[PDB]
Amino acid sequence: QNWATFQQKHIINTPIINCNTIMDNNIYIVGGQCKRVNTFIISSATTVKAICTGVINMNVLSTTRFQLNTCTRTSITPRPCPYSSRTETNYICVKCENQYPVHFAGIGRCP
DNA sequence: ACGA
C-alpha cells in the first residue's frame, strides 16, 4: 500500500531459512487469518526502490533479476499456519507510485 | 486478490 509497508512485508536482507517462522507475524494476518502468499525479496531497500526511479504511477517489471523466497500457506489453522517455500531468481513486477514500490504485483511478469 |  505504501513504501514503508512494502519494505516491511517484502524486503529482507538475508535468505528465508524457514517460511513457517517468518510468516508468524501479525503483519501477515488479513481478515483475521494467515495470508495466502507472500514473496520475500532478498535485497536492500535501495536496490528494490531503484526499480521505480523516474516512475510516477505504473506497474514496472524490473530490468534485473532478484533472489526471491515465496511462502505459500498450505492450510488455514490457528496461528501460526503452515507454509511451503519456493525459491527462485527472477524479475519482479511492483507498482511504482511517486518512485516508490507500493505493492508486489508479480514474479517474472506484470499482470 | 502478495494494496487500494
Side-chain angles (χ1 to χ4, degrees), chain A residues 2-105:
Chain A
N2 45 68
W3 176 222
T5 307
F6 181 89
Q7 295 178 72
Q8 293 160 179
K9 287 176 180 168
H10 301 287
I11 301 180
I12 192 174
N13 48 45
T14 50
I16 296 300
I17 61 173
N18 193 321
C19 272
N20 304 101
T21 64
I22 195 75
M23 293 304 288
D24 182 6
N25 188 145
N26 201 52
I27 191 177
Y28 300 118
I29 301 301
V30 51
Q33 303 294 325
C34 48
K35 210 172 192 177
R36 193 181 108 269
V37 59
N38 189 72
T39 296
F40 287 96
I41 302 169
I42 317 304
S43 187
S44 67
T46 297
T47 297
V48 177
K49 178 172 172 176
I51 295 170
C52 295
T53 303
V55 194
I56 299 293
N57 184 206
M58 85 149 88
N59 276 157
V60 175
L61 178 65
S62 68
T63 63
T64 47
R65 294 180 194 190
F66 285 78
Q67 170 171 171
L68 314 170
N69 292 180
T70 295
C71 300
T72 305
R73 179 185 71 199
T74 62
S75 178
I76 299 181
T77 67
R79 298 166 59 173
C81 301
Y83 286 81
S84 64
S85 45
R86 187 183 294 179
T87 57
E88 64 179 291
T89 297
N90 212 165
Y91 305 96
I92 55 174
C93 180
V94 302
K95 176 69 188 304
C96 294
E97 276 166 23
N98 300 311
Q99 306 197 294
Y100 295 103
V102 304
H103 168 64
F104 184 90

